[PDB]
Amino acid sequence: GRLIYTAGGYFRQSLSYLEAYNPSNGSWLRLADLQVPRSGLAGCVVGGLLYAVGGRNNSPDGNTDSSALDCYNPMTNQWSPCASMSVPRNRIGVGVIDGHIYAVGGSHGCIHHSSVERYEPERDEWHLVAPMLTRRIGVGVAVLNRLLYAVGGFDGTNRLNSAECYYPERNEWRMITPMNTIRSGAGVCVLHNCIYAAGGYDGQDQLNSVERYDVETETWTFVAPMRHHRSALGITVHQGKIYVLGGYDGHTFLDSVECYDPDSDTWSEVTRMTSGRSGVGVAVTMEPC
Numbered sequence: 001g002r003l004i005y006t007a008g009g010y011f012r013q014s015l016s017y018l019e020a021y022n023p024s025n026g027s028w029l030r031l032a033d034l035q036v037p038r039s040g041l042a043g044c045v046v047g048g049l050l051y052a053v054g055g056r057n058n059s060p061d062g063n064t065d066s067s068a069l070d071c072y073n074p075m076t077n078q079w080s081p082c083a084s085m086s087v088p089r090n091r092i093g094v095g096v097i098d099g100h101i102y103a104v105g106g107s108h109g110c111i112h113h114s115s116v117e118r119y120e121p122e123r124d125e126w127h128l129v130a131p132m133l134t135r136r137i138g139v140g141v142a143v144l145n146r147l148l149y150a151v152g153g154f155d156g157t158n159r160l161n162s163a164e165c166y167y168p169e170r171n172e173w174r175m176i177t178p179m180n181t182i183r184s185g186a187g188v189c190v191l192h193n194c195i196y197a198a199g200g201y202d203g204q205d206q207l208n209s210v211e212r213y214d215v216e217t218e219t220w221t222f223v224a225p226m227r228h229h230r231s232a233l234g235i236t237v238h239q240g241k242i243y244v245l246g247g248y249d250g251h252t253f254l255d256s257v258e259c260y261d262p263d264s265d266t267w268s269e270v271t272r273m274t275s276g277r278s279g280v281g282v283a284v285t286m287e288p289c
């Protein structure tokens, strides 16, 4: 069986929680805390290992943007540090291609990054690649057909509807069709041949809307909206279903977890996180042992 892992997040301050949800039975496990609290991080999995990337420790005793990469092994229930990134990246996006981790955008204080770097687990090494055409924090990232997409975000001045694609063999970014909605701090993932962008902040409101980009038609189509408006949500795919976790609706740090069934085009309440939080990192791997 495989679990949905949520790492870190924010409520009152940045959080160190690592908790795993089992869609088969509805259960939550609390697992080993992150060594350093962090919100605005991303999660990913490579070789059955869970990685937590970037973020920020918003704490009463100060605010520290994170360049950290840390690895969680479900077999041992232990976190280990990996090589740090070139730069702190709060409100980061990440994607995995061919066993490598791409770290995209994010902020360091008032620095809004367009830079991108790639981590190679085999060598515990980061290397910068071509920067994006746009500065993007709160950027959504997904991978389809070994191409990397950076979607929406905030450039330091404006929230963005724009999106762009990275072609690894050309080390080159190109713009794609923009979304039909401005979205910053959305959830972005892949399902089938489509990039989905769920929720976000448009500069005025948290969004419940959801749209998807078909790489073959180069067009975005709205699907059914989520049951909750949310920015700074976590998102993942577990057995062909999209799950969204937490976020902020303009009133409450949400504990709501919803899942999308593409065949019926419906969103369902699935479970509640143990506590409301925004800006988590989320990914899916094996059960501890």
Ligand SMILES: CC(C)Oc1cccc(-c2cccc(-n3ncc(C(=O)O)c3C(F)(F)F)n2)c1
Pocket: 009, 010, 039, 040, 091, 137, 138, 139, 153, 154, 159, 184, 185, 186, 200, 201, 231, 232, 247, 248, 278, 279, 280
């Ligand atoms: C929800 C907000 C009031 O408290 C937090 C706290 C910690 C992290 C986060 C977060 C996480 C991921 C992305 C974003 N980003 N990035 C840009 C933006 C924007 O405004 O453009 C946002 C937004 F969600 F906050 F919405 N934030 C939000």
Ligand SMILES: [Cl-]
Pocket: 039, 040, 056, 058, 090
């Ligand atoms: Cl923040």
